[PDB]
């Protein structure tokens, strides 16, 4: 009972491998930090303006009002995430061989669904790890920021809490993330079929990977695919929120790379 | 256990055939002409509608066209909700769930099922109407007023892609059941039995596809991702209904409260 299964495991290993090489902060590490293990250090916790302030010292993170400072923080980290995801996509067999326009298109629409997915790896009901895991910002501090900014994270936490319920590990994510990138239903693709063939193979690999890694958790495959609905809505609420800041913060600059992704859509 | 899954599949199918008079198999027969017996009356332009309103009885008439057409789509939806409701009752486990959860699962699942089955009565040029007696063109629909001109366009968008999967009634019966037993509907009181049931339905669906479409074993996954396509359309629709909520009897408003 090991026919084409071999091919699929091989692909799984390949992606898991690229994933480790493309993302310095994996779920496994973020968990060792959040559950107080001994393989990792403990984070500094920001829960208020006061705490935040000592955090500048204690943490330091490559960086006028607090809300905007934090907002500018996510942008920089998001930009970095895009770089990592772009580097990971290139390792997906067949991706770099597709039409360049479509490669740009798949990344344009796939990058955020992947950022929030992976962002769940650094979250628990109470907060989120920051500065490569050196810090932890509580859900509450974030939910209290100035009128518009404090509404950015709550829906991510809500998704994270439900998504983490599936209890997936980095090896599962590597494939699932690869499925998201290769979506032949993205607006403006010029050559859908090639893209779909790849995703089809990825899907078979993820299906096998979920049965083998979570034998007791039946229909995990079915439940995970359904999670896409949550992702799309997160993206939507987010862009609208961005529209608001753009008209209320005329002195604020949205990172060019982010402007290009968010552009048309 | 495979035999139990096939049994569940036959049961849902037999029940589907009894709750939905106009099946996909029948509909496809009418759309391709495989049944020249009774071809449908076409409604391509303003003039034909007027004539069709005379030919076909249409039980939704009491004069601005665009609205009349909409009230028709609503009347049919209310009927569809009763059919779906009778079908759900036959899904093993459903009636044993808490009553409030039954109502909840139906309340949030009828739209998804309606548009799913609507795909069955459509092709790129139009949708079959009034029990198959008619056929309203896609172009005629597009060419409607402001808030109405883009009411159905989204459904046709979905329909063409959904019909690409080439599913038949026995596949749909299981798929529809899966959509009903969704454990993530807001306000549920006892999620465990719901997901337990969906679990079994997905197993039955997975086997049904592999047997009924041996030459395309990724179909299950593809079918599942179409479920998210459905939720988006339901979002766009309720949203549009608000742009319509902007006006367009009080006893009638009660019947179509939703
Ligand atoms: C601000 C615009 O939001 C982004 C999306 C986005 C939103 C929130 C978000 O939360 C993470 C914040 N975040 C930080 C915030 C301040 C300082 C460091 C980090 C940090 C370090 C490592 C990892 C994460 C980190 C990460 C990305 C976009 O629109 O592309």
Swiss-Prot record, chain A:
Gene Ontology MF, one: WW domain binding
Presence of the UniProt keyword Transport in the record: no
GO cellular component, one term: chromatin
Compartment(s): Nucleus; Cytoplasm
Induction remarks: (Microbial infection) Expression increases when incubated with M.tuberculosis or its lipoprotein LpqH; induction is TLR2-dependent (at protein level).
Main location: nucleus
Effect of residue 21 to R: More than 50% loss of ubiquitination
Activity regulation field: PDPK1 activates its transcriptional activity independently of its kinase activity.
BP terms from Gene Ontology: BMP signaling pathway; cell differentiation; cell fate commitment; cell maturation; cellular response to hypoxia; cellular response to insulin stimulus; cellular response to low-density lipoprotein particle stimulus; epithelial cell differentiation
Chain residue ranges for the region called Interaction with FAM120B: 1-49
Residue ranges crossing the lipid bilayer per the database entry: none
Keyword Lipoprotein carried by entry: no
Domain NR LBD: 7-264
Residues the record lists as binding rosiglitazone: 75-78, 112, 238, 262
Family, as annotated: Belongs to the nuclear hormone receptor family. NR1 subfamily.
Function per UniProt: Nuclear receptor that binds peroxisome proliferators such as hypolipidemic drugs and fatty acids. Once activated by a ligand, the nuclear receptor binds to DNA specific PPAR response elements (PPRE) and modulates the transcription of its target genes, such as acyl-CoA oxidase. It therefore controls the peroxisomal beta-oxidation pathway of fatty acids. Key regulator of adipocyte differentiation and glucose homeostasis. ARF6 acts as a key regulator of the tissue-specific adipocyte P2 (aP2) enhancer.
Disease: Defects in PPARG can lead to type 2 insulin-resistant diabetes and hyptertension. PPARG mutations may be associated with colon cancer.
Record-given protein name: Peroxisome proliferator-activated receptor gamma
Organism taxonomic ancestry: Eukaryota, Metazoa, Chordata, Craniata, Vertebrata
Span covered, complete protein: 232 to 504 of 505
UniProtKB/Swiss-Prot annotation, chain B:
Induction conditions: (Microbial infection) Expression increases when incubated with M.tuberculosis or its lipoprotein LpqH; induction is TLR2-dependent (at protein level).
Motif 9aaTAD location, chain numbering: 250-258
Domain of life assignment: Eukaryota
GO cellular component: chromatin; cytosol; intracellular membrane-bounded organelle; nucleoplasm; nucleus; receptor complex; RNA polymerase II transcription regulator complex
Protein's GO biological process: BMP signaling pathway; cell differentiation; cell fate commitment; cell maturation; cellular response to hypoxia; cellular response to insulin stimulus; cellular response to low-density lipoprotein particle stimulus; epithelial cell differentiation
Residues bound to rosiglitazone: 74-77, 111, 237, 256
Keyword line: Activator, Biological rhythms, Cytoplasm, Diabetes mellitus, Disease variant, DNA-binding, Glycoprotein, Isopeptide bond, Metal-binding, Nucleus, Obesity, Phosphoprotein, Receptor, Transcription, Transcription regulation, Ubl conjugation, Zinc, Zinc-finger
PTM comment: Phosphorylated in basal conditions and dephosphorylated when treated with the ligand. May be dephosphorylated by PPP5C. Ubiquitinated by E3 ubiquitin-protein ligase complex containing FBXO9; leading to proteasomal degradation. Ubiquitinated at Lys-18 by TRIM55 leading to proteasomal degradation. Ubiquitinated by E3 ubiquitin-protein ligase STUB1/CHIP; leading to proteasomal degradation.
Cellular compartment(s): Nucleus; Cytoplasm
Molecular function GO labels: alpha-actinin binding; arachidonate binding; chromatin binding; DNA binding; DNA binding domain binding; DNA-binding transcription activator activity, RNA polymerase II-specific; DNA-binding transcription factor activity; DNA-binding transcription factor activity, RNA polymerase II-specific
Region (Interaction with FAM120B): 1-46
Domain NR LBD positions: 4-258
Crosslink position(s): Glycyl lysine isopeptide (Lys-Gly) (interchain with G-Cter in ubiquitin): 18
UniProt disease annotation: Defects in PPARG can lead to type 2 insulin-resistant diabetes and hyptertension. PPARG mutations may be associated with colon cancer. Obesity: A condition characterized by an increase of body weight beyond the limitation of skeletal and physical requirements, as the result of excessive accumulation of body fat.
UniProt remark on domains: The 9aaTAD motif is a transactivation domain present in a large number of yeast and animal transcription factors.
Family of this protein: Belongs to the nuclear hormone receptor family. NR1 subfamily.
The protein, known as: Peroxisome proliferator-activated receptor gamma
Gene: PPARG
Shown residues in whole-protein numbering: 235 to 503 of 505
